[PDB]
C-alpha cells in the first residue's frame, strides 16, 4: 500500500464541500483506511481597486474577494483504489492534487 | 537569343504552344534555367538539349554571337514572339526572355519531337 494525499482546493464554497463529503463517503467502504477531510486556510485574495476611470472628485473604491479554500485528505489504498474514488464528476473548477509516497 | 527581325526558319503557331507547354512540365518535374545571363552560359557549355529564344532582346550583347554559334554546337533553337509569352510558359507567371531546359522530366516524349522537326528545317 501507498499513503496518498488528495489535496483539493476550490474557488467557491458549495463546490468544494460536496466533493470532500463524497470522497469521504465512497472511500469509507472497500480496502481503504481514510483520515478525515481536514480544512486548511482560505488564502483570501484581496484585490483593492479604483472604480472611477476619471480618478475624479470622490471615487468610490471596489474591494475584491477571491477566496480559495483547501481541503486535504490522507488515504491508505492502492493506485487502483485511488482511480475508483477519482471517478466522481467534480465541479468545474475544483483542483485535485495527488502526491504518492509509501 | 533572337530579335523581332531574325526570321530564318518558320515557327508555326502549333509548334510554339507545345514548346510553351514542354518547358512548363520541364520546371515542375526536372530542372529549368531562366534569366538570359544564366541561359547564355547553358547553350554554350552544352547543358541545353533544345534552346527556345524569345524575339525581343535589344540592347545586343547576348544577341549578335548566338544565332551563328548555336548551329555549330548541334542544338536547335525555336522562337516565341514575346518575353511575357515565354515567361508564363517557363513554369512561372513572371517573365523569362530566355530559358534552357537542362533535363526533360515528363516533357520527354514532346521535347524529342519538336527538336528533330526544327533541326530538319534549319537549326
Amino acid at each position: 500500500m501507498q499513503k496518498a494525499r488528495i489535496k483539493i482546493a476550490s474557488t467557491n464554497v458549495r463546490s468544494l464541500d460536496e466533493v470532500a463529503n463524497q470522497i469521504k463517503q465512497i472511500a469509507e467502504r472497500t480496502g481503504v483506511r481514510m483520515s478525515g477531510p481536514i480544512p486548511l486556510p482560505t488564502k483570501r485574495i484581496r484585490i483593492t481597486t479604483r472604480k472611477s476611470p476619471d480618478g475624479e472628485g470622490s471615487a468610490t473604491f471596489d474591494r475584491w474577494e477571491l477566496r480559495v479554500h483547501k481541503r486535504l485528505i490522507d488515504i491508505e489504498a492502492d493506485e487502483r483504489a485511488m482511480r475508483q474514488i477519482m471517478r466522481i464528476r467534480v465541479p468545474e473548477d475544483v483542483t485535485i492534487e495527488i502526491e504518492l509516497i509509501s | 537569343m533572337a530579335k523581332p527581325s531574325y526570321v530564318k526558319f518558320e515557327v508555326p503557331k502549333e509548334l510554339a504552344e507545345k514548346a510553351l507547354q514542354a518547358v512548363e512540365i520541364a520546371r515542375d518535374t526536372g530542372k529549368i534555367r531562366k534569366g538570359t545571363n544564366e541561359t547564355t552560359k547553358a547553350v554554350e557549355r552544352g547543358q541545353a538539349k533544345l534552346v527556345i529564344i524569345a524575339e525581343d532582346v535589344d540592347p545586343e550583347e547576348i544577341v549578335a554571337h548566338l544565332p551563328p554559334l548555336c548551329e555549330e554546337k548541334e542544338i536547335p533553337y525555336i522562337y516565341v514572339p514575346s518575353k511575357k509569352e515565354l515567361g508564363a510558359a517557363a513554369g512561372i507567371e513572371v517573365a523569362a526572355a530566355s530559358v534552357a531546359i537542362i533535363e526533360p522530366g515528363k516533357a520527354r516524349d514532346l521535347v524529342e519531337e519538336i527538336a528533330m522537326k526544327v533541326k530538319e528545317l534549319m537549326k
Partner: protein, 50 residues
C-alpha cells in the same frame, strides 16, 4: 531593380567568370571585388583580399 548586370564574359563556344570566388566558404559565391576589399554575396560578410 537595376539593369544592366551582364558582367560574365564570353568565349567562342565557352564562358568564363569575371569576378572572384570566395576562399572563406566554398565555391558558388562571387566577390564584389573592390581591388583590396571583398564583400560577400549569399549573406554579407566583411572579407579582406587573400
Amino acid at each position: 531593380m537595376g539593369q544592366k548586370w551582364k558582367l560574365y564574359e564570353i568565349k567562342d563556344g565557352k564562358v568564363i567568370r569575371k569576378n572572384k570566388f570566395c576562399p572563406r566558404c566554398g565555391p558558388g559565391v562571387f566577390m564584389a571585388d573592390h581591388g583590396d576589399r571583398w564583400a560577400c554575396g549569399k549573406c554579407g560578410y566583411t572579407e579582406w583580399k587573400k
